[PDB]
Each structure stands twice: as C-alpha cells, then as structure tokens.
Ligand binder design. Structure first.
Ligand SMILES: NC(=O)c1ccc[n+]([C@@H]2O[C@H](COP(=O)([O-])OP(=O)(O)OC[C@H]3O[C@@H](n4cnc5c(N)ncnc54)[C@H](O)[C@@H]3O)[C@@H](O)[C@H]2O)c1
Ligand SMILES: NC(=O)c1ccc[n+]([C@@H]2O[C@H](COP(=O)([O-])OP(=O)(O)OC[C@H]3O[C@@H](n4cnc5c(N)ncnc54)[C@H](O)[C@@H]3O)[C@@H](O)[C@H]2O)c1
Lengths: 282, 282
C-alpha cells in the first residue's frame, strides 16, 4: 500500500486524529499538505514530526480556517504545486455542545461551518480537479482518494450535540453523492466514523491506560487503506472504526411497513394502526 | 385526532405539500400560522383556502425567509399571540441541483440555509418555548408536536443533489437530538421522508393520472397523526411515506465487522481482508 509520489491533504492535522493520519500517510511515502487553523499550528510540532524520513516524506503546513473558500483554494493550489492532488482526508472539526433549547445560532452555525461547509469546499474543489484531470487525460483514469469523517453521533443524534450530529450526518450524505459522481473517473470516496482517544475526547473516553484500545492508530490503519491504490473497489462505503475492528455500515433497513388495503389510508385507521404498534414497542 | 384549540406553524405552506399539510391540520380544527417567502404568498390563495370553515379554522399568513432568525422569532410570537405553540411542521425547502464538480458555494449554502438552518431555528425556538412552558407548569406536561421533513435523498446521496442530501440527512440527526432532549417534557419529534406529486416534483414523477398514487394527501394523513395527541408514544422516529403506505425506518444496521485477532490490525492484513471482501461484492 505504498503512497510514494502521491500528495495528500489532511485537515485538522495539528493534533489528535488528523495529526496521526498525516503521520500515517507520510510513513507510506506520501507528501502531506498539513492544514489546521493557525493557533493550532502555533502549538504543534507536527511538521517537524513529519520528518519520518524514509521516502520523499515531504510535508508542508498550510494554515487556514477550512470553512473559508480561500483555505480550500490554497490547499488545492499547494497540492498542484507539489505535483497533483491524489488524497484528501477531511478531518477538521470543532464542538459547541449545548442542550438544543439553550443552543445559540452561533453555536449551531460554527459547527455546521467547520464540519459540513469545510468538508464541502475541499470535496468540491477536489471533485472539480479530478474530473478535469480525467478530461485532460482524454478519458483516462485518475487516481483520487477522498476520506471524509462522520461520526456515530450522526446516526444517533445524541443529547447536547444536535449541531455536531447534523453536520456529521450531512457529511455522510455529501460523501455518498461524491462517490456516485466521481467513482466513474477512478476516484474513491468513503466515510469513516472513528473513536480515538485524543486530548479532545479525553473527558469522554478517559486517559490512555500492548496498545491503547482507543489509539488513533486503529483509525489510521483504515485511513491508510482508504487512501491507497488497494481500495480501488471501495467507493461510497461507510465504516465505523475503533480498536482492532472495522465495521461496514449497511444501507438503511426498514423496520415495518404499514400499508392500507386500498388506494388510501383512512386517517383514523392509520392512527389506530400506528398507535397500537407503538403501545407495545420499546 | 381532533386538533381544536391547538396552534400549528407550517413552513413552506404557500403551495405543494406544505399547503396540503396546512389544510389537513386546519380541517382537524387547528389554528394555522402559514409561513412561506413573500413571493410564494403573492401567487397563493392558501389563506383564503383555509376557510375550511368548520372548527375555529383560523389561519394567518406570516411571510418570511425561514433561514433568517427573525422569521423563526416572528412565527413563535404569532403562535404565542394566538394562545400558545402546539405544533410545528418544518417543510420549507428549495433545490439547487448541480453535479458536485460544478456546484458553486452559493448553490451549496442556499440549500443548507433554507432546509437545515431553517429547520434548526424553528426547532430550537420551539424547544426553548416548550421546555420553559413545562418549567412554568412546575414540571407539568406540555403538548408539543414537531414534524420535520427529511428525504430518501438524505439516506442515499443522489447524483446532482449533494447539497439537498446533506441538508436532509442533517435534518434527521437534528430531529433525533430534539426527540431525546424534548420527549421528557411531553414533546414528540419525528421525521418524515415523503414523496408527493407537486408542481416542483412534476418533472421527476410526472403529472397526476380513485386517488393519485402520489397525492400529497397520503403524506398529510401521517402528518395529521404525528401532530396529534394520539402520537404521544411516537418520538424520535423516521418514516418514509408515499401512496397508501407508511414505512418505519430502523436504526442503522451493520453489514459486516472486520476484527483483528489481537490488540491491533496489521495494516497490510487489514488491506488484504477488505480488498478480498470488496472484490467479491456488488
Ligand atoms: N464522535 C466520535 O466518536 C469521535 C472521536 C474522535 C474523533 N472524531 C472526529 O474526528 C475528527 C478529529 O477529532 P480529534 O479527536 O482529533 O479532536 P481535535 O479537537 O484534535 O480536532 C482535530 C483538529 O481540528 C482542527 N480544526 C478546528 N477547526 C478548524 C478549522 N476551522 N480549520 C481547520 N482545522 C480546524 C483543530 O484545530 C484540531 O487540531 C473530527 O472530525 C471529529 O469529529 C469523532
Ligand atoms: N425528495 C422527495 O422525494 C420529496 C418529494 C416531495 C417533497 N419533498 C420535501 O417536502 C417539502 C416540500 O416540497 P414540495 O413538493 O411541496 O415542493 P415546493 O417547491 O412546493 O416547496 C414547498 C415550499 O417551500 C417554500 N420555501 C422555499 N424557500 C423558503 C424560505 N426561504 N422560507 C420559507 N419558505 C420557503 C416554497 O416557497 C414552497 O412553497 C420539502 O422539504 C421537500 O424537500 C421531498
């Protein structure tokens, strides 16, 4: 799964999971464009840490708020300047947790902006770059890998995280569309829903106690695959990954269909049917 | 399922499904606050049409872009001025379809704003109103019904609709959080994924040919239930509804787990396992 000669963009890569992902791609030979907000990069040695330095191992930092069009444009330009854009790992995020009934517009908008708009801007920019490259190839295949970061919160809607859950669910649907649009060009686009012990999850998961059962490395192993030639037949998939396991999420299932016997439901009859079903139901 | 004495807010109710939903609640006795953008209301007789007029049947139009905080505030104030807010049907939406690689930032932001931010602003405002009412009741139960509108596109990510799919998936996750926060106060919050023949779906579904198999009325019957006392035991549920059937969507299922036998996946081994699984897989 060697990534020599490839260029990867990883967002939110100053610390935590994004930093671990940037290091894992660098270790496979990728040239990594490391993105984060500038204050995160003030306090990070990640670029020095990416002197790991078997392989071309080149790394460059590009500071910017991923929710801004200009950041996505600069990342693309940096990657083109390094020889072409091959791999995108959308990982940047923030939380503004609040009970829904106390959540301000700003708490909502900020989380939507960094997760959902940020994923969009770079996914769209990459989408346009990869399609144009395929047309420039006179219909030839392009190598492209898109790895977007959702969360089990987007499947579940946890209390106090309506904004985080909404962004992560949107990210999943965004990536499925991208997979349908781009798979025909040779691009693979997939979604991960990780759990990893980082400084930002330490309050929920605890601190690290072989290998940490919630090591970021458990996630990196999957991201390395999804970024590689070897994932050519994996597109539009959603994975849950933490510890020594990866789980493929299936398409939506149906619990129960409630059909009228004729051309329309009688409304009081529909009411009776649903009310009875949910009276005896957990 | 009589809604006499209740007040309902329906957004996007000048035409199409929202208009049919406003009429169906009015027919059950609800006082309806009809919301849409003002240009939609220029061309609509919906308020006159809500002279149906058994029951209090009162209806008032409140024009506003639902993506703006002030519209959500005015709708709440109107409902309080009519005696209290009981029912919210978030239905307003737009499409800006485009292949992802051609999608502008504005095409993305507008669809996110009207669907996702609009759902949020009114869901949050209602959430704060219903909780405060319960506290004012010294812990007493409040009647509250929230009906949000997602889409099968949010489960599926169709080509050319990454922005629509992302908004609808976010709406679902938003509503699940709301259901967890608010169910304890007596509020029910549920999601519908409709198909209905409207002027805006006529290009995809065709025109209307008993009853139209894609009549908006098939959806209205479910919305009437979900807005009613009779749905007290239905909270946090996701329904697909079109024609003479309602389908309860189940929580996410897992297709297949890929576990290492020890404390971590060997990355080349994980690659081998996933590559083999997806070689022989549709
Ligand atoms: N829900 C879960 O179970 C779970 C657990 C771990 C990680 N995650 C997801 O994985 C990702 C990383 O999480 P983490 O555990 O590394 O925590 P983290 O706080 O380290 O987030 C990673 C990075 O995002 C960066 N970032 C924030 N705003 C940015 C912006 N506007 N532009 C660019 N970069 C920005 C931060 O600076 C940070 O370094 C996130 O998407 C997160 O939601 C989810
Ligand atoms: N994907 C599907 O299968 C499907 C089919 C039908 C309806 N739907 C959903 O149901 C809802 C209504 O769809 P429709 O079929 O009635 O089409 P429609 O175009 O009539 O949409 C309904 C209303 O939304 C209103 N609206 C738009 N922007 C607004 C804003 N900024 N503020 C307030 N109101 C605004 C429009 O003016 C319109 O009257 C939407 O949510 C739509 O996505 C989905």
């Amino acid at each position: 799964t060697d990534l020599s000669g490839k260029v990867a963009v990883v967002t939110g890569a100053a610390a935590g999971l994004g930093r671990a992902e940037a290091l894992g791609l660098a270790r496979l030979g990728a040239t990594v464009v490391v993105n984060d907000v500038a204050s995160a990069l003030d306090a990070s040695d990640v670029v020095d840490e990416i002197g790991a330095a078997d392989a071309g191992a080149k790394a460059v930092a590009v500071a910017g708020d991923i929710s801004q069009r200009a950041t996505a444009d600069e990342l693309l330009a940096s990657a083109v300047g390094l020889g072409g854009l091959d791999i995108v790992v959308n990982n940047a995020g923030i939380t503004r947790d609040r009970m829904l009934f106390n959540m301000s517009d700003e708490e909502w908008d900020a989380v939507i902006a960094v997760h959902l708009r940020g994923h969009f801007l770079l996914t769209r920019n990459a989408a346009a770059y990869w399609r144009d490259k395929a047309k420039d190839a006179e219909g030839g295949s392009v190598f492209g890998r898109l790895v977007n970061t959702s969360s089990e919160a987007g499947l579940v809607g946890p209390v106090g995280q309506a904004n985080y859950a909404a962004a992560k669910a949107g990210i999943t649907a965004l990536t499925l569309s991208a997979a349908r649009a781009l798979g025909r060009y040779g691009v693979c686009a997939n979604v991960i829903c990780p759990r990893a012990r980082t400084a930002m999850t330490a309050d929920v998961f605890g601190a690290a106690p072989q290998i940490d059962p919630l090591s970021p490395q458990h996630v990196v192993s999957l991201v390395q695959f999804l970024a590689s030639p070897a994932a050519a037949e994996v597109n539009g998939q959603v994975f849950i990954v933490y510890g020594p396991q990866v789980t493929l999420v299936s398409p939506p299932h149906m619990e129960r269909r409630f059909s009228a016997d004729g051309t329309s439901w009688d409304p009081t009859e529909l009411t009776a049917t649903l009310r009875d079903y949910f009276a005896g139901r957990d």
